[PDB]
Design a protein around this ligand. Sequence first.
Ligand SMILES: Nc1ccn([C@@H]2O[C@H](COP(=O)(O)OP(=O)(O)OC[C@@H](O)CO)[C@@H](O)[C@H]2O)c(=O)n1
Ligand SMILES: [Cl-]
Ligand SMILES: [Cl-]
Ligand SMILES: [Cl-]
Ligand SMILES: [Cl-]
Ligand SMILES: [Cl-]
Ligand SMILES: [Cl-]
Ligand SMILES: [Cl-]
Ligand SMILES: [Cl-]
Ligand SMILES: [Cl-]
Ligand SMILES: [Cl-]
Ligand SMILES: [Cl-]
Ligand SMILES: [Cl-]
Ligand SMILES: [Cl-]
Ligand SMILES: [Cl-]
Ligand SMILES: [Cl-]
Ligand SMILES: [Cl-]
Ligand SMILES: [Cl-]
Ligand SMILES: [Cl-]
Ligand SMILES: [Cl-]
Ligand SMILES: [Cl-]
Ligand SMILES: [Cl-]
Lengths: 410, 411, 401, 411
Amino acid sequence: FKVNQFRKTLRHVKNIVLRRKNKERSLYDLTDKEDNVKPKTIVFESFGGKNYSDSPKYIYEYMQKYYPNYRYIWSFKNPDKNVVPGSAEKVKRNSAEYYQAYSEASHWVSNARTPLYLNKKENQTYIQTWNGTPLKRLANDMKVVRMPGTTTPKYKRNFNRETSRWDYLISPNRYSTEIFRSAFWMDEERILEIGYPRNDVLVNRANDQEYLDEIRTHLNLPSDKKVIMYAPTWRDDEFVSKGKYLFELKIDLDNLYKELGDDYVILLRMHYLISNALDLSGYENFAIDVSNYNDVSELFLISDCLITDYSSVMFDYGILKRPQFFFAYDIDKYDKGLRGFYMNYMEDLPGPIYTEPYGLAKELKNLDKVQQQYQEKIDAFYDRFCSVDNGKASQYIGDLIHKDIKEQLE
Amino acid sequence: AFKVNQFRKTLRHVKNIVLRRKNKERSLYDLTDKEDNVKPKTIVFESFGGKNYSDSPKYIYEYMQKYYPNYRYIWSFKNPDKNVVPGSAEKVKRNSAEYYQAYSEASHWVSNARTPLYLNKKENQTYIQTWNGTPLKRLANDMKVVRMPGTTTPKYKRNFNRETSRWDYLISPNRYSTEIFRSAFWMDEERILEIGYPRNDVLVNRANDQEYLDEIRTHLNLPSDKKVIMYAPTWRDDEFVSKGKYLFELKIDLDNLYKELGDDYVILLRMHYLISNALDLSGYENFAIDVSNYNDVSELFLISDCLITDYSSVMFDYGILKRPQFFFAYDIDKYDKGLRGFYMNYMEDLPGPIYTEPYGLAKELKNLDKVQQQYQEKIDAFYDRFCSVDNGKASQYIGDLIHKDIKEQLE
Amino acid sequence: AFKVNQFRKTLRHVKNIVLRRKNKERSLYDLTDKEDNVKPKTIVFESFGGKNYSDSPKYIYEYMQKYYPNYRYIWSFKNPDKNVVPGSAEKVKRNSAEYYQAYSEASHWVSNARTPLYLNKKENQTYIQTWNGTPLKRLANDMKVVRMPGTTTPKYKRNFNRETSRWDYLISPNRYSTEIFRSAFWMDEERILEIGYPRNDVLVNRANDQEYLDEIRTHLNLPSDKKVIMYAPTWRDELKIDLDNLYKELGDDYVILLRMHYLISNALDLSGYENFAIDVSNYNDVSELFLISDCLITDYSSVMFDYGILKRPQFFFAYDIDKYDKGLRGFYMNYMEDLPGPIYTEPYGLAKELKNLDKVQQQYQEKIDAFYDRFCSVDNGKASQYIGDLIHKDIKEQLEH
Amino acid sequence: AFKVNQFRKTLRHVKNIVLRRKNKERSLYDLTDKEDNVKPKTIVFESFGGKNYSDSPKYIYEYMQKYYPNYRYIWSFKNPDKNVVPGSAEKVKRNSAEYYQAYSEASHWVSNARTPLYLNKKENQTYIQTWNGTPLKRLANDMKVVRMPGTTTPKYKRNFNRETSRWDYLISPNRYSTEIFRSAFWMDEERILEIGYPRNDVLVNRANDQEYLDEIRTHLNLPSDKKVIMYAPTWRDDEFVSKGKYLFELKIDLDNLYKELGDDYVILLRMHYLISNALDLSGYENFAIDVSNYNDVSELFLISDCLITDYSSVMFDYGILKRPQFFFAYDIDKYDKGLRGFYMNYMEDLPGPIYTEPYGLAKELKNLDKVQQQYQEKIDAFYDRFCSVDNGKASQYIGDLIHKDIKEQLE
Ligand SMILES: Nc1ccn([C@@H]2O[C@H](COP(=O)(O)OP(=O)(O)OC[C@@H](O)CO)[C@@H](O)[C@H]2O)c(=O)n1
Ligand SMILES: [Cl-]
Ligand SMILES: [Cl-]
Ligand SMILES: [Cl-]
Ligand SMILES: [Cl-]
Ligand SMILES: [Cl-]
Ligand SMILES: [Cl-]
Ligand SMILES: [Cl-]
Ligand SMILES: [Cl-]
Ligand SMILES: [Cl-]
Ligand SMILES: [Cl-]
Ligand SMILES: [Cl-]
Ligand SMILES: [Cl-]
Ligand SMILES: [Cl-]
Ligand SMILES: [Cl-]
Ligand SMILES: [Cl-]
Ligand SMILES: [Cl-]
Ligand SMILES: [Cl-]
Ligand SMILES: [Cl-]
Ligand SMILES: [Cl-]
Ligand SMILES: [Cl-]
Ligand SMILES: [Cl-]
C-alpha cells in the first residue's frame, strides 16, 4: 500500500464525509490512471473556460471539418451559456464529467494556464497556444509580484510548474519565441513558430466580402461609414464608486462625435467592468459598445484603424497593414523610461503616440494621409511581428494532433 | 451532531501515525487535549524557544522555587541533556510526548518569546508573556515589509496576531514600551504589567554585592587590576561571507584596542553565535574574552564598567546601572540615513556618543571619568525614561501572581 | 465533549477504505447517517432478507401503489436484476451504497423478517414488522437450545431482542399468536396489530374470482381435468412420500404441486412425472398456489394456518414424528390433538385416504371449523389496507410540524 | 510501503491510546514484538494463569536456581505482591508493560496451563508445557459438548488447538496420558516427554525425609499421636446456593468421622476455594483442619496415610506413594450413569473401593492395614499403569533441557 495513494485516499474520505464540493476532484486524483486515455478524445478550453473563442476555437473548427470522427469535448465555467458548433459536447469545470474529459483525453488544447490539480500524464499531449505576442514582461521575467495571497518566488514556482507540462507552445514570431524561451522556462525544441490560429482569418478572409458584410450587419452598422476600433487596456487608478458611474473616457466621445460622427463609427472594446458602467445615450449609431462580442478577430477585419495603448492586440491587428494610433494619456505614470516592456515603445510601433485626444481626432479625419505618412513604420512592424502568419496555423495544429493520434492507435 | 473538528484531527492523526511522521506526537496531543488535563499546581517555563535556561523565565522560576517549593515545575528545551536547571523542575525536550503533556497539564505557561501556534491555550490556562526587551527596531504590526521566505507580510502579521491574542499577561519595562506593545502586538493595556523585567532584578538588587561580582569575574578567569569593556553589536547579514570560515577582523579593530587599552582594560565580546566560532582571538589572550556563550547576560552587565553597542535593545537594560555607553554605529550610513524605523530618535536621546569609526571611541575610552561626567545628563535622562520602573521585585510580582492565580483554582 | 462513538466509527471506516474492504459502503453510512437524512415520503420494502418480491410486503406495496402513488418507493434485493417489480418503485442491491442511502433516507421500513442490526433505526423512522406466519414451533425467546453455527443460545437471543425492540409495529394473525409474540419477541401488546397478514388478502377477496383462478393455473400449464394436491414439507438437514406410488394411486384425478426447499428442489429428477408432479418451488406468490389448491399436505409448518382460511382439507404427513422428541412440547399448540386433518407417518394410507376428498371434508368439518375459528377468524383481507393507511397517516403527521 | 497486518495493529493501538484503554499495554507489545527482542538467558514461569507460585513450574524453577543461578528468571502473577518467590527471579503483574517485556524477551516459557493466544510465541522461543495431570475426564478435543457461554464448542476447540500447536514440549506422566494427549491436544508424539511431573519429585525423593515430614506437620499445628487422612472432593455446581453464605455440611458427615476416627485420626480437608471460606469447622478443632489454601499439595500427600476423593486427577499423583485410596462418590448415579465420559474404567481399575454412603467408609477406615492388604493388589496394579514413570528427576530433566537449549542459542 503506497504512501502516495494513502495520502490521496485520506484526502478523499475527508471530502466525502465532510461533503466538501471538492470530492469530485479527490476521487479523480485517486482513479486517474494512464489507462483511461482514449487516444481519440480531445479537450478544448479557452481563457480558463469562460468562452468558446480564440485559437482553441479555430483549431476546433478546423478539426471538425477534416476530422469529424473524434471525441470533441469543450470545457466551460457555465456550459449552458455557451454555444458550440459541431460534434463537440461540453462539460462544467470542476464537475464529474470535467475530470473524466481531462483524464480520458489524448490531447489538451488551450490558450491559458490550465490548473495544476489536473494530472497531465506522460500519456497525453498538452498543446499551448497561449494568447499573444507579449508587450508586458510575464512569468519569469517579472521583477516584483505583490499579488495577494502569494509571494513572488512561489508564484514563479507554480508558473514554472505549469509550463513544464506544456508539450507544445505556439509562437507568432521570433521575438515572442526568444521571450517565451526565458519567460516560460521553455525549450526551443517544444516551440512552434506558425502564428496564431485565431489570426488565420486576418490572412484568409480579409478580402472576403460576404463575410465582412455579415459581421458588419450583425453589428447593425451604418453602411457609408468607416470604422475605428478603440481598445484601451485596463487600469486600476480608474475604478471608483464601486463602478456605478465612471468619468467619460479621456478619448472624449463628445469631441469625436463632433469631429468624425459623419465619416466614422467607433467601436469601443472595453474591459467588462468599464463596459456595463458606460453610458452611451446620445451616441447611438456613433459609438457602439462592442465589449462582449465573442470574436475579436472579426472586429479587426472590419476596422479601418485601431486605437490602443499598451496591448498585445496591436501585434494582431498588424497583420492587416492598417494604421494604428496609441493614445497613451497616462503614459507619464508608466515608469518614465519603462524597460518593463520587451520592445521599445518610443521607437518602433506602427503609429503615432498621442497623449491627448485632440491631435488624434484631427489626424483621423483623413486616414489615407496617415496610411502614407506611416507606411514605412507599419511595414517595419509588420515585418518584425506579423510575417510568420501563414493563415495555416489552425490547420498545422489540427494536423499535428491528427498525426499524433495515428501512432497511439496501435 | 457530527463533531467535524474532531473528525478532522482524527484524520490528521491517522495520517501521521501510518506514515511514520515525526509529528504523530503533535496530532495525538491535539486530538485528546481536553480542558480537564489541567492541574492547577503545574507550571511550564521556556526561554527563547527553549534554547536556554536564562532570561526572565529563569528568574521567575528561581523565585517561585524558594517560596513555592510545593508546585510542579517543568522546563522545555530543544536539548534537555545540554541544559542545567537548579531546583526541583523536570525537563521536557521540545516536541516530545512529555512536552505536549506538560503543555496540556499546566495551569500556567511562562515564556519570553512566541510559543508555537500548534500548542493549544485552553481558557483553562494562563499564558504569561515576559517578552524580551524594550524595543528599538519596529516589530510585528508596526513593520512595513517582511520579505521573509514562504510567507508574506500580511500572513506573517496574521500569525503574530494569533499568538499575541493568547497572551493573558504581557510584561512592560516602561511607559514607552507599553505605548508600542499596545499597537505592535495588538494588546489591551488591561493585560500589560509595567513592572520591569524579572531579569533585571539583579541590576537593582545586586550591583553592590562585591562577593557576587567576584564569582562572575572569576567564573570568567578575569585579570584582577583591569577594568571591563563589554561589546555587544547586533547581527548584520551583509557581513557574512566565505561560509563564515574566516571573517574580516571586527571593525572595532581589536589590534588598535589592545595597543590603546591592553594595559588597563579587558574587553568582553558578546557576539552572535556564528561570528563567535569564527573569531581568531590568537594574540589577545587576557584582553579579548569571548563571552558569546555565557548563560546569563545580566551578570555580564554587572561587572561591566561600560558598554559598547549600536542598534540593540540591550542598551535599555544596561541603563539601570547608569554607567557609560558608546554606540559604535559604523554602518549607520547604510541605515536609511535619517530614519524613524526606530521607535525612538536614535540620533538624539541615547545615553552616549555615536562613533562611526573605532579610533575616536578607543581614545575616549582611555578616560572613563571624563565620559561619565560629560554624558551624565544624557545618562540620567535616559534612565528617567526607560529605567524608572525596575525595583528588582519583578521576579517576585510574577510568582505571587502565579500563586495567587492558582489558590483561586483550588476552590 | 469527545464524541467517542464517532471516533470508533471513523477508525473502522478508515480501516475499510485502506484495506479495500467490501464493507466500506457500510462504515461510510455508519459515519454519516443522521436523523436529517430522512425524507418523509420514502418507504422501503424487503421480504425474506431480500430474496423475493413476495408476500406481505409485496401486498402492502401493491395496495399503496394504487392509492398513494406519489410517495417514493424502494425495494431491497439480494439481486435486483433477477426480480421484476410492478410500478414506480426503484430497486436496490443489498450492501450497495444505494441500499444504505435508502435505509438512511426512508421514513418507514416495511419487512417480514429480521433486518440487519448494522442498519440504524432512528428515533425518527418507523419500522413496521409483518413477520411471516402464525408460529408452530417455538421461536425467539421461548427456545431451549440453539447450538446454531458460531453462536451461543443467549447471544442469539440477545441479538434477537435487539432486533425485536426496533420493531415499531408488529403484525398479528390471532390472539394465540399475539400471546405468543408478546413472550417470544419481548413485545409490548401496544405495538402489536391483530389484523391478519396482508399476504392473506387474496385468500378471502379473490377466493371465488374464477377468471383469476384460471390465469394462475394456465400460468402453470396445469391439466384441465385434475384436482390439485399441494405438498409443502418444512426443512430438514427420492421423496419420503413415494411419488412412484402417488402416481399409481392418484394419477387419474390429481396432479400434485411440490413446494420444497431450493436445495432439494434441483435434486428432484421429476422425469416420468411430468404432467403429474409439478415442481413449483421457485414460484413467487404462495397464496396464489393455495387458491387453486384442493387440499394441502404439510407437516410442521406455519403454512397450515394460512391455508386453513380456505376451510379445505389438510393432511399432515409427519414421517419424522418419532425423531422429534417423542411426545413433543416444542409446539405452542397440541399437535397430536387439534389440527384440521389426519396425521400420517406412512405415505401409503395417506394416498388411499386422499383418493376421495369429500369423505375427508365431512370427517373433519368439525375439526376444520374449530381451526378456522381459532387461527383464521381474524383475517379480513383488509390487512394491506390497514397497513397502507397506517403508513399514510403516519407520514402526514411527520409532514406538518 | 506499509504491510496489511501492521496497519491493522497500528490502528488497533491508536484506538487504545486515544480511549485510555487498559489494553494499550498489549497493543504496543503487538506492534513492537520482534523475533529479535529475545535474550537467550531469559526464562518466564507462570502457573495456573498467575494464580500461584506452585507445582511443576515451581520445582523446575527451584532446581534451576540451585544449579544455574546465572540466568534471568521471571515469574508472572495476577498479583505479584500476594506471592512469595524464593531466589533471584523478578516478578511481573499480568498485563503490565513489564509482563509483555518478559514474554517478548524470553527464550523459554515454562507453564502448566494454557497461556493466552494474544501473546506471540515467536519461532524464536521455546514454550514448554508441563500441564497439570493425568486425565480422568475428557479434555479439549475429546470433549463431546460444552455449552460455555461466550463460546461455542467448535470455537473452543479451534482456540485450544491454536494454543497446543504452540507447545514445543508436552510433559507426560505415563503412556496412558500420552495416547490421550496425542489425540485430545492434537499432539505429535515427537513433542511429548514422558518424564513424569516435576511436582511429583518430592513424592519420591522425600517420601522418607523425617526431618522434613515433621516440618510440614508442625507448620500445620497437627497433633503428635495422630494419623492423617486427606479429603479432596472435586467441585460440583449442585452444592452452590444462597450467595455461598451458608453451605450444607459435607456429605461425608464430619460429626460421624469425629466419633469414629477421632481418637486416632486427623482429617485434612482440601476443598474448593469457595467452599473453604464458607465452611464452619467450629467444634472440630484438632480433628478437621481446613487445608484448602495450602501452597503445596505435594507436601500434603507426603504426610497422608490415605486419601479420600472422588472423580479427580489427584488420585494419580497420590498413586506414586502406594497408599490406600477411597473414593467417596456419593453422587455417582447423577454422573451420567455408567459414564464413558471418563477415559479409564472407573468401576474397576482405581486402587480402592467406591463408597456412596460415608458410613461404611468411616468404619472401613478404622483399620488402614486391613485395607492396605485387602487392596494391596489393586494399589500395585494402579501404580504400574500410572505411576511407574516418575524418576524423581523430572524437574532436573526440564531444567537441563532448558540449559542445553540456551547453549546453542548462545552464538
Ligand atoms: N414449504 C413452504 C413453507 C413456507 N412458505 C412460506 O413461508 C412462511 C413460513 O412458513 P414455515 O414452513 O413455518 O417457515 P418459518 O420461516 O419457520 O415460519 C414459522 C414461524 O416464522 C412462524 O412465525 C409461510 O407462511 C409461507 O408463506 C412457502 O412458500 N413454502
Ligand atoms: Cl511507497
Ligand atoms: Cl451552467
Ligand atoms: Cl493564464
Ligand atoms: Cl502534472
Ligand atoms: Cl500575452
Ligand atoms: Cl499562484
Ligand atoms: Cl526579433
Ligand atoms: Cl463616456
Ligand atoms: Cl472522529
Ligand atoms: Cl494540582
Ligand atoms: Cl537531549
Ligand atoms: Cl539539569
Ligand atoms: Cl525586543
Ligand atoms: Cl579584530
Ligand atoms: Cl420527502
Ligand atoms: Cl443483481
Ligand atoms: Cl486490544
Ligand atoms: Cl541473553
Ligand atoms: Cl499486585
Ligand atoms: Cl503464537
Ligand atoms: Cl495404559
